Amino acid sequence: IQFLRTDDEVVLQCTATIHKEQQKLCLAAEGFGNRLCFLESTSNSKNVPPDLSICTFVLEQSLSVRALQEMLANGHRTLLYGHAILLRHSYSGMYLCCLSTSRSSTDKLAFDVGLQEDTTGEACWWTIHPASKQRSEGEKVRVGDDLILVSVSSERYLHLSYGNSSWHVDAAFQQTLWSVAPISSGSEAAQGYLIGGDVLRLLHGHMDECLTVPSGEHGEEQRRTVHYEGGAVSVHARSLWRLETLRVAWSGSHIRWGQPFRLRHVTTGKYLSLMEDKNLLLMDKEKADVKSTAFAFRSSKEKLDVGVRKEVDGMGTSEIKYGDSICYIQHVDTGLWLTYQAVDVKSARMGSIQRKAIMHHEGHMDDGLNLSRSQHEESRTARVIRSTVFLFNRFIRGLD
């Protein structure tokens, strides 16, 4: 019943039935470094979580064909069938368009989909159609409606092409159904309140430290280690965290107490995982299990409510703020709490001030976790940093 307004974040998923098994593949875009899009596995998120940050698009304008051709020959509106929309990538800021070159040799007449900076021409616009006979043109689109996106320039369908390794969406003449998952409704997002999908960090009330990992001067084995640090680390790229919600719809809503979410490091791309024989470390997405990587924020230290909140399909309620909101980390499996240690012996205490974060039952009653969100500039900078260091390590290995 919820209508699709303008200037709201949505995700474009679809189902592919290959090898006699169904799968839910989404549309994702790297943005920086490459132009063409690719596919993301929303399903099978039990061991491999999908990178939700790059599969989010925003509708800018919703004009008819006449108005589109008319402006082209030269507000919170509502999505209507038959109209033409403009899908701007939330992360990269570019716009989804239909490219002219070809990459999949299996389709000698189909075109590729990607991103472009300018909004000129008919490539960056996509006209919308229904996929059922119950809804005709001029009707209002609602959540869950099966739609078909057709290019305005090439007049081709946004087809889900199949390949051995070229699992790449293209612009072909065979249609493909696409489902719309809302994330942020574009409504009044409470300023100073915690919103899902944010890139933020934590600080202490009277310690002025943040949860971070060692810098790049050490190897990856030490960067996997976790601790607290102060000083210039207050403003760094290796000090930010992302709250990846397990939900695929409305993941960018008001985060409430008790719900689970992974803690991703924007610089390394790994998650805070826990095996009982050791403490918490960083591990990649290829083995990120919901059990070991799911955490939550409590308002106290007791265990009065654990399995109370199940699912809310909406924007939620503005509960958790950034400044005056003392959270407490709690694992979904062990239920332990953050504790700062004195791993540094007195022999080097005046050196690198470093207090490791061990999850335990008792803890210390002075943590006072205060949230602090990072601006779009620092978030995008950290993400692009991770991207180029990954690509450059790949190039260095390939050259060596």
């Binding site: 051709q69 020959a73 299996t106 389709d107 007449l109 320039s153 007049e155 003449f173």
Partner: protein
């Protein structure tokens, strides 16, 4: 023309499987295999329907349809948008070098023979598609076409004394 192109691209099965699809490459190999079938009687009816000649005629008719369906001589295409769009669609559907190769086949000039094969009119459809979809506006392209696809046929036509079985 616009609605015909729209229907043809909506239903891609109307095009030949040798031209359109994940199998056959295009009209070059299509025409070569059709000539092979017309020459080899093991792929026909043992006045019968020459399957190779029929494939060639079908492809020539499709190319002639697309050519005559091209927007215009750039009267409205010079300042119009959907005309340019249809022209780009036709160009992406039919490659140029393929058309040049199909034009450059240099059929024989034969005691008469049977004309139920690669008819000289099959070349006219490709010529019309070239003139309407792409056109002749580049000097080296014109010269190359004149060398590869025109001089052999011009010599075969000029080399006639009395035995004129094909006008």
């Amino acid at each position: 023309a616009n609605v015909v192109v729209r229907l043809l691209i909506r239903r891609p099965e109307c095009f030949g499987p040798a031209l359109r699809g994940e199998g056959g490459n295009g009209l070059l190999a299509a025409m070569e295999e059709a000539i092979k079938i017309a020459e080899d009687p093991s792929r026909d009816g043992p006045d019968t329907i020459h399957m190779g000649n029929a494939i060639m005629t079908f492809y020539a008719a499709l190319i002639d349809l697309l050519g005559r369906c091209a927007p215009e001589m750039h009267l409205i295409h010079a300042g119009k948008g959907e005309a340019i769009r249809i022209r780009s669609i036709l160009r992406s559907l039919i490659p140029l070098g393929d058309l040049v190769g199909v034009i450059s086949i240099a059929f024989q000039m034969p005691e008469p023979d049977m004309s139920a094969g690669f008819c000289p009119d099959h070349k006219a459809a490709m010529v019309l598609f070239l003139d309407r979809v792409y056109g002749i506006e580049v000097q080296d392209f014109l010269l190359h076409l004149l060398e590869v696809g025109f001089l052999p046929d011009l010599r075969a036509a000029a080399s006639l004394d009395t035995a004129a079985l094909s006008x």
